[PDB]
């Protein structure tokens, strides 16, 4: 009885210590990931600020999103009356999507077609899109993944809005 | 009964040490989230700055009241020094803290009295325990940015390392425009 009590103290302490090892490990994982997202975002921001052409801006954003952030599907479409479409062509295709806020989850078939092309549409389960606007509408930036759980919430798609904020301020310089 | 007593004693120590370790890790994660957000906002505010005054004012107000740093120094270098904020000549800067301007590192966030007195105007700068200093250079040396804390271990923090350096890089790029 006296030993059974202290034995139970040992079981309870072990359970607690195992539980805290799980939390510690889970916290160290998210810490490491935020360090990455932070570093990749920094390099993106500085590379965008140091861009000398519109082509270098586009290349920077696509290279980073695809190969630093490991986004399966990336679409950056700039609007121009001069890839890029007319603003009027953009509203004809996907008008009803743009209206500062990030839209995510299951987009409509015809919107996935315009952003990601006919082929890729079908392998995209979730997607997040944002308008590139700062003192004018400069285009649209979209990211997509086959996992429909990825890019369903604001949490998973938060970086997209941060990039769009900076990218939208950089596009007018060209 | 003494094997089981010995077991409980070591399990308790281990348990206590883990709790504290996990607690600190949670505090650090929370502070880093707060700092990520303030940095994001500062970067955009800087890109949106419409003047030199707006640039320097935004940095100092943000670092002091958003980041909540107790000691803040922003000095711009200029021969013809005319400004609301602090402005000294590059020559004068280098006489006081030139080793750090040239890209040098301090030993354990410890500045020397004359360096503290050059960087920090706060009447209680004598209470600074550690500091981080970074020069503002991008296609030229534009000035110096410095933060200080009463805590001697603060120079090792994510603020002192990551965030300050990134703020400096954006600030160094934006200053040339004015």
Contact state of A13 with B8 under an 8 Å Cβ cutoff:
yes
Distance from B12 to chain A by nearest Cα, in Å? 7
User: Domain of B115?
Assistant: 1-178
Residue A74 dihedral angles phi and psi, to the nearest 5°: -125, 130
Cα within 13 Å of Cα(A112), Cβ side: 20
Q: How far apart are CA B71 and CA B147, in angstroms?
A: 6
Q: Could you please report the per-residue DSSP string of A94-150?
A: HTTS---PPEEES--HHHHHHHHHHHHHTT-SEEEEEEEESSSEEEEEEEEESSTTT
Q: Tell me the chain B residues in contact with residue A20 when contact means C-beta distances shorter than 8 Å.
A: 15, 18-19, 22
Give the nearest chain A residue to B139 (CA atoms).
A50
CATH of the domain at A116: 3.30.450.40
Of B8, B19, B29, the CB nearest to A6: B8
For residue B139, with 0-12 CB atoms within 10 Å meaning exposed, 13-18 middle and 19 or more buried, which class applies? Answer: exposed
Contact state of A6 with B11 under an 8 Å Cβ cutoff:
no
Query: If we measure between CA atoms, which residue out of A45, A37, A39 comes closest to residue A166?
Result: A45
Which of A2, A4, A34, A160 to mutate to probe the B interface, most B CBs <10 Å? A34
Which DSSP state fits B160?
A: I
Q: How far apart are CA A102 and CA A129, in angstroms?
A: 6
Provide the domain count of chain B: 1
Which DSSP state fits B176?
A: G
The CA-atom distances, in angstroms, between A96 and each of A68, A99, B21 are 31, 7, 50
Give the nearest chain B residue to A43 (CA atoms).
B166
Q: How far apart are CA B92 and CA B86, in angstroms?
A: 12
Q: How far apart are CA A23 and CA A17, in angstroms?
A: 10
Contact state of B22 with A20 under an 8 Å Cβ cutoff:
yes
Count of pairs with CB atoms under 8 A, one residue in A, one in B: 67
Of A16, A28, A46, the CB nearest to B169: A46
Q: Which long-range contacts (CB under 8 A, 24 or more apart) does A157-163 make?
A: A157/A102, A157/A104, A157/A128, A159/A37, A159/A41, A159/A69, A160/A102, A160/A128, A160/A130, A161/A102, A161/A130, A162/A41, A162/B40, A163/A41, A163/A44, A163/A61, A163/A65
3-state class of B168 per DSSP? helix
Alpha helices per DSSP H over B49-153: 52-61, 90-101, 113-119
3-state class of A157 per DSSP? coil
Which DSSP state fits B121?
A: -
Q: Which long-range contacts (CB under 8 A, 24 or more apart) does A93-102 make?
A: A94/A140, A97/A129, A97/A140, A98/A131, A98/A137, A98/A140, A99/A131, A100/A131, A100/A133, A101/A130, A102/A128, A102/A129, A102/A130, A102/A154, A102/A157, A102/A160, A102/A161, A102/A164
Q: Are strands B86-88 and A126-133 parallel, antiparallel or unpaired?
A: unpaired
Please say whether the beta carbons of B138 and B169 come within 8 A.
yes
Contact state of B11 with A10 under an 8 Å Cβ cutoff:
yes
Those residues with Cβ within 8 angstroms of residue A29's Cβ, 6 or more apart along the chain or in another chain: none
Which tokens go with A24?
């510690």
Q: How far apart are CA A57 and CA A48, in angstroms?
A: 6
Q: How far apart are CA B152 and CA B170, in angstroms?
A: 27
Q: How far apart are CA A33 and CA A37, in angstroms?
A: 6
Q: Tell me the chain A residues in contact with residue B7 when contact means C-beta distances shorter than 8 Å.
A: 10
The CA-atom distances, in angstroms, between A11 and each of A3, A6, A21, B1, B61 are 12, 9, 15, 15, 53
Q: Are strands A73-79 and A84-85 parallel, antiparallel or unpaired?
A: parallel
Query: If we measure between CA atoms, which residue out of B36, B31, B164, B134 comes closest to residue A35?
Result: B36
The CA-atom distances, in angstroms, between B141 and each of B53, B84, B173 are 18, 20, 11
Contact state of A17 with B18 under an 8 Å Cβ cutoff:
yes
Angle CA A161–A164–A170, to nearest 5? 155
Please say whether the beta carbons of B127 and B144 come within 8 A.
no
């Amino acid at each position: 009885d006296a030993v059974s009590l202290v034995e139970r103290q040992v079981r309870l302490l072990r359970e607690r210590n195992i539980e805290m090892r799980h939390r510690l490990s889970q916290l160290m994982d998210v810490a490491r990931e935020n360090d990455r997202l932070f570093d990749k975002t920094r390099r993106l921001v500085l590379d965008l600020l140091d861009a000398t052409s519109l082509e270098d801006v586009v290349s920077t954003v696509e290279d980073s999103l695809r190969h630093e952030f490991q986004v399966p599907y990336v679409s950056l479409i700039l609007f121009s009356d001069s890839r890029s479409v007319s603003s009027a062509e953009a509203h004809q295709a996907i008008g009803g999507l743009l209206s500062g806020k990030t839209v995510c989850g299951v987009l409509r078939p015809h919107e996935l077609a315009f952003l990601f092309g006919e082929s890729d549409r079908d392998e995209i389960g979730s997607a997040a899109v944002v308008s590139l606007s700062f003192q004018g509408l400069h285009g649209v930036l979209a990211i997509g993944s086959p996992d429909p759980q990825h890019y369903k919430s604001s949490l998973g798609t938060l970086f997209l809005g941060y990039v769009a904020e900076v990218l939208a301020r950089v596009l007018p310089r060209f």
